[PDB]
Scaffold this active site. Structure first.
Site, short mmCIF file in Angstrom:
data_model
loop_
_atom_site.label_atom_id
_atom_site.label_comp_id
_atom_site.label_asym_id
_atom_site.label_seq_id
_atom_site.Cartn_x
_atom_site.Cartn_y
_atom_site.Cartn_z
N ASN A 211 2.73 13.15 6.82
CA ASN A 211 1.70 12.76 7.62
C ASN A 211 1.79 12.33 9.04
O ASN A 211 0.77 12.04 9.77
CB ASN A 211 1.22 11.43 6.91
CG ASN A 211 0.38 11.61 5.70
OD1 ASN A 211 -0.42 12.62 5.65
ND2 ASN A 211 0.25 10.58 4.69
N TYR A 212 3.03 12.60 9.45
CA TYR A 212 3.32 12.96 10.94
C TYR A 212 3.91 14.32 11.22
O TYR A 212 4.89 14.51 11.71
CB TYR A 212 4.17 11.69 11.56
CG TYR A 212 3.56 10.52 11.45
CD1 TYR A 212 2.41 10.13 11.95
CD2 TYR A 212 4.53 9.30 10.92
CE1 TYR A 212 1.84 8.70 11.92
CE2 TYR A 212 4.03 8.01 10.86
CZ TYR A 212 2.74 7.88 11.29
OH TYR A 212 2.02 6.56 11.26
N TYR B 79 10.76 2.04 16.24
CA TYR B 79 11.53 1.92 15.07
C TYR B 79 10.80 0.99 14.21
O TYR B 79 10.42 -0.17 14.56
CB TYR B 79 12.76 1.13 15.42
CG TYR B 79 13.62 2.14 16.17
CD1 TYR B 79 14.62 3.04 15.55
CD2 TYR B 79 13.59 2.22 17.45
CE1 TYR B 79 15.40 3.79 16.20
CE2 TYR B 79 14.41 2.64 18.20
CZ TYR B 79 15.54 3.58 17.70
OH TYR B 79 16.34 4.36 18.47
C1 LIG Z 1 -4.20 8.87 13.51
C2 LIG Z 1 -3.09 7.96 13.17
C3 LIG Z 1 -2.50 8.36 11.86
C4 LIG Z 1 -1.79 7.41 11.04
C5 LIG Z 1 -1.57 5.98 11.52
N1 LIG Z 1 -1.13 4.94 10.91
C6 LIG Z 1 -0.37 5.43 9.78
C7 LIG Z 1 0.26 4.51 9.00
O1 LIG Z 1 0.42 3.13 9.27
N2 LIG Z 1 0.84 4.82 7.81
C8 LIG Z 1 0.54 6.05 7.20
O2 LIG Z 1 1.45 6.34 6.26
N3 LIG Z 1 0.13 7.17 8.16
C9 LIG Z 1 -0.35 6.78 9.14
N4 LIG Z 1 -0.94 7.79 9.99
C10 LIG Z 1 -1.02 9.18 9.61
C11 LIG Z 1 -1.93 9.61 8.52
O3 LIG Z 1 -1.46 9.12 7.29
C12 LIG Z 1 -2.43 11.00 8.54
O4 LIG Z 1 -2.47 11.48 9.79
C13 LIG Z 1 -3.23 11.38 7.52
O5 LIG Z 1 -2.92 13.03 7.02
C14 LIG Z 1 -4.68 11.26 8.13
O6 LIG Z 1 -5.69 11.86 7.08
P1 LIG Z 1 -6.92 11.81 7.49
O7 LIG Z 1 -7.60 10.82 8.38
O8 LIG Z 1 -7.88 12.43 6.27
O9 LIG Z 1 -6.82 13.28 8.44
P2 LIG Z 1 -7.32 14.83 8.22
O10 LIG Z 1 -7.20 15.10 9.91
O11 LIG Z 1 -9.02 14.72 8.10
O12 LIG Z 1 -6.82 15.54 7.41
C15 LIG Z 1 -5.23 15.38 7.29
C16 LIG Z 1 -4.92 16.71 6.38
O13 LIG Z 1 -5.22 16.31 4.99
C17 LIG Z 1 -6.02 17.40 4.60
N5 LIG Z 1 -7.10 16.57 3.85
C18 LIG Z 1 -8.07 15.68 4.36
N6 LIG Z 1 -8.88 15.28 3.42
C19 LIG Z 1 -8.57 15.85 2.35
C20 LIG Z 1 -9.29 16.14 1.13
N7 LIG Z 1 -10.41 15.15 0.89
N8 LIG Z 1 -8.51 16.87 0.27
C21 LIG Z 1 -7.53 17.59 0.42
N9 LIG Z 1 -6.89 17.60 1.77
C22 LIG Z 1 -7.51 17.14 2.70
C23 LIG Z 1 -6.56 18.06 5.73
O14 LIG Z 1 -7.34 19.35 5.70
C24 LIG Z 1 -5.40 18.08 6.68
O15 LIG Z 1 -4.26 19.05 6.46
C25 LIG Z 1 -2.25 5.62 12.64
C26 LIG Z 1 -3.09 6.44 13.57
C27 LIG Z 1 -3.92 6.05 14.56
#
Ligand SMILES: *Cc1cc2c(nc3c(=O)[nH]c(=O)nc-3n2C[C@H](O)[C@H](O)[C@H](O)COP(=O)(O)OP(=O)(O)OC[C@H]2O[C@@H](n3cnc4c(N)ncnc43)[C@H](O)[C@@H]2O)c(*)c1C
Ligand SMILES: *Cc1cc2c(nc3c(=O)[nH]c(=O)nc-3n2C[C@H](O)[C@H](O)[C@H](O)COP(=O)(O)OP(=O)(O)OC[C@H]2O[C@@H](n3cnc4c(N)ncnc43)[C@H](O)[C@@H]2O)c(*)c1C
Lengths: 498, 498
Positions: free
Chosen positions: B446-447, B375
């Protein structure tokens, strides 16, 4: 072209910058200076020298002692915004700014070029202190020490009249500053000047492509992670397991061993951790790699009543390295008070030493899950270079490392007691320290321990500098006197001028 | 620039690049491409578009699903070598390349300029996926979302004839491409084009010094870390404790609250972990801050038999951020298989919801000390913006997160079954999902959880896209249709064309 940043105590950044990896040592300078270029490092040094301010440099903040953060330090030059890593086409070598951390270096060199160098296993360690001390880690048996790839070093130095300048000292036989280069091959940080950047390359690299300028690691590894519960562990168990480990390691620590690719680290935790742990790795492309791991793990248990729990898996090299690395964030990294000690071996610990170790590791009047001593595989390629050619002591076959880590300043006395008494009792035949002899090779300057200069803990009569530098100290003293004649750069273990 | 790197299966790097944060999804493209500039990204995309290849982009690799690493993806463009972070004087904004990770960004912004933005608490998360989804973290109550600072974005896009170009889209009311900018304030990654860089700045920044272009975090925080022993916990204590937490958070989730500065996270691990854990922080400069934390900790305990263990201390901001951050290395980070779920709340869980959770959290036929629901305090400044001005759903007071992490592929079925069943049971009144209503607000893109599109787990009749996007999905479909008319960028949860 950003101007250097100055952080005084009225800036919110000051309290953060004052704190590094060891919360026992909180800096209190007049100011922190964060420069962006070598020219700005010259400016900073020149200011402090002009007014006689005491100046120290910080790169990654991993010092085990208060060398940077001493209360008598007036100016800390923090190089963390100088973190560039990239291939320098003109030198045929990878340029690493001193503020780069090892974790970042490895990621950049590996993904962009497929190459690595054999540096440590902790992510936030700065190049600045790490390399000059003789960096080692898991690939050292195969690849040697970081300083084995030190092509050149850029250093900001201070002459007798206080004039501050920059010099590049290289490995080349005709380099008139070759002595300054040599001193940075194990003389340790905080001694000769401010290292602004290093250049790394294999001395026999082929051609001039970056992909050939440093070694390629093995593609993937077999990894074993093992643990022995404390529950039923007895002195007999403990002493046989460690003796089996040392036995096997000492038979297998030269380039001639068909098991030289196999690296293992045995973590002997205090009882309060609930387990002893080991991790091991061996490259997939070694003849019979998977069975060699099995043979090794078998020999370990031979004569030991505790059955270990054991997980085995295969991983790409960089994942292996990251899996075993120590985090630079989280409860293990941040806000932690520490004490570390070091002692290196070319023969085994006796039965008596190991039982002494057991007494302290099993002690039930003590509670600290982070308290441990470790036995670290070493040797191999480290020991087949010409040893005269660098400053780092060679000859150890195996390294040992002791640590305690806690958060409460009120418990300082008991944790410091614990570690001091365990290290003393293990070395009680040699005055409580590892005096270089037939079994001990000394200790490592990148795990400094001021207790080695304390007559209450070192009763051997052997001075700290012999333990850390062996026979290389007088040469280091000569170079120090040539390059820092005013002794601008100093700390409790800095090279003393003649 | 160095030419872009191409990595095919014959290169040792390929198996490393194929693995990212979730080891359940191993990619197998024709090749990985690692570009160093926007022009090289355009070239990579233009190649894939010409020949009809399926392309995805990776920045930090934290995706919770196989959006990047699907077996049918032919080319993966990996942006990890484009990680520049710097102030751009001409726009008066911080430039952040897509491949910079959040940990790095914070360190650069803070040490060099004394500023921050409210992004997440995980070290290795890439800007690329993180910002476009509406990143949040511990400072969001005080500062809002990352997308509240999105000044501009540079995106490589593909027109209807397959011509690839680069556009910069800004927040300015008259920008002809403001729709594209808006889509990146919550629309999520992998949808509209390749984000090469972002620019961050407060919309009401004074002047044009970088020290003013983003907010200064509070200088230091009081921190409390609490744990409650599972050995001492009953169902009634669990239900009361979580109820106490939710009630206090729902009375204190607006900017009007004198406790808005207090951020807390409650982690309700499965029994096999041995404890429930909470961390809380409040800036030292809040009126009566230390007492406010005491008041909060006392309310949690009222009517609850288990006494918790507690440590309290004061730390600088960046240190408290790093203390709570999730490491990008070590055993918790590397070689790990995972499943995550998400559900956001604007009202409390009922008592039956909480006993349903207790049932799965104490289930003794399951073992996984990494299994948890959490939570997470939210709201505050997040909910005082004009919500129309960005794409991110707003309205949640509180976020919840579910995770299981493991290493053995043989265990996939039982871990996936555990997290699916707990989440379904907690949401059984609404067809197993958090359908937006008077208590649930939906879930966070983003999850992502592909189970929300699976008619065996989602029996609510509410589509995945409503749950993640609220009412903004059709506008996003319109922007999608304008800017990626050929649907080049797609994945299981990509915005479908109109
Ligand atoms: C693993 C992890 C994720 C977390 C963590 N803590 C977070 C928090 O405290 N707050 C948040 O708001 N989010 C948290 N998250 C979740 C992450 O935000 C997401 O998992 C993000 O999507 C991760 O982004 P990234 O590291 O870039 O992941 P990728 O797997 O490379 O891509 C995700 C997704 O986005 C597309 N994408 C990436 N790069 C681009 C660009 N440059 N342009 C367009 N689209 C892009 C990918 O193709 C894919 O679809 C804590 C932890 C441990
Ligand atoms: C904390 C830590 C240290 C480790 C770890 N693992 C290691 C490993 O696997 N192999 C190793 O060989 N060493 C390991 N160490 C020890 C580190 O190598 C040492 O702690 C290094 O000395 C740390 O370097 P750095 O991070 O730069 O520490 P600082 O505290 O900034 O400085 C140390 C020392 O050196 C001087 N110095 C720093 N920078 C410069 C420059 N640019 N020029 C001159 N001198 C410099 C300082 O003034 C100070 O005297 C694993 C872990 C977790």
């Amino acid at each position: 072209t950003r101007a250097a940043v100055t952080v005084k105590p009225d800036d919110h950044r000051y309290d953060l910058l004052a704190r590094a990896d060891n919360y026992r040592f909180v800096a209190q300078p007049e100011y922190f200076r964060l420069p962006y270029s070598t020219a700005q490092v010259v400016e900073a040094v020149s200011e402090a020298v002009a007014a006689g301010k005491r100046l120290t440099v910080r790169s990654g903040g991993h010092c085990g002692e208060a060398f940077v953060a001493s209360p008598d330090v007036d100016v800390i030059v923090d190089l963390s915004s100088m973190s560039h890593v990239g291939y320098d086409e003109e030198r045929g070598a990878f340029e690493v700014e001193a503020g780069a951390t090892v974790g970042q270096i490895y990621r950049v060199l590996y993904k962009n070029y497929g190459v690595t160098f054999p540096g440590g296993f902790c992510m936030g360690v700065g190049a600045g202190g790490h390399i000059s001390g003789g960096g080692y880690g898991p690939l050292s048996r195969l690849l040697g020490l970081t300083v084995d790839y030190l092509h050149a070093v850029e250093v900001v130095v201070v002459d007798a009249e206080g004039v501050v300048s920059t010099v590049v000292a290289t490995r080349e036989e005709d380099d008139p500053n070759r002595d300054l280069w040599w001193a940075h091959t194990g003389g340790g940080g905080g001694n000769f000047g401010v290292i602004t950047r290093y250049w790394l390359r294999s001395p026999d690299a082929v051609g001039d492509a970056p992909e050939e300028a440093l070694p390629r690691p093995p593609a993937s590894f077999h990894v074993a992670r093992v643990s022995w519960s404390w529950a039923e562990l007895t002195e007999a168990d403990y002493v046989r397991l460690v003796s089996n480990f040392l036995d096997w390691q000492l038979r297998n620590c030269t380039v001639d061993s068909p098991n030289i690719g196999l690296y293992a680290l045995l973590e002997c935790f205090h009882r309060s951790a609930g387990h002893l742990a080991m991790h091991a790795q061996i490259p997939v492309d070694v003849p019979d790699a998977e069975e060699r791991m099995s043979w090794f793990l078998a020999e370990l248990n031979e004569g030991v009543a505790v059955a270990p729990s054991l997980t085995r898996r295969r991983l790409p090299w960089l994942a292996t390295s990251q899996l075993l690395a120590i985090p630079d964030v989280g409860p293990g990294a941040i806000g932690v008070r520490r004490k570390v000690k070091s002692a290196d071996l070319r023969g085994p610990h006796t039965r008596e030493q190991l039982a002494a170790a057991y007494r302290h590791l099993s002690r039930a009047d003590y509670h600290c899950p982070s308290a441990a001593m470790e036995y670290i595989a070493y040797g191999g390629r480290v020991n087949t270079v010409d040893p005269a050619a660098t400053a780092v002591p060679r000859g150890a076959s195996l390294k040992t490392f002791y640590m305690v880590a806690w958060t409460d300043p009120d418990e300082d006395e008991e944790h410091l007691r614990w570690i001091r008494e365990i290290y003393r009792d293990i070395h009680s035949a040699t005055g409580g320290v590892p005096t270089p002899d037939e079994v001990n090779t000394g200790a490592y300057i990148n795990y400094p321990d001021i207790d080695l200069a304390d007559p209450e803990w070192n009763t051997s009569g052997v001075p700290w500098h012999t333990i850390y530098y062996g026979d290389n100290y007088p040469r280091l003293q000569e170079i120090k006197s040539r390059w820092d004649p005013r002794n601008v750069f100093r700390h409790a273990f800095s090279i003393r001028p003649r």
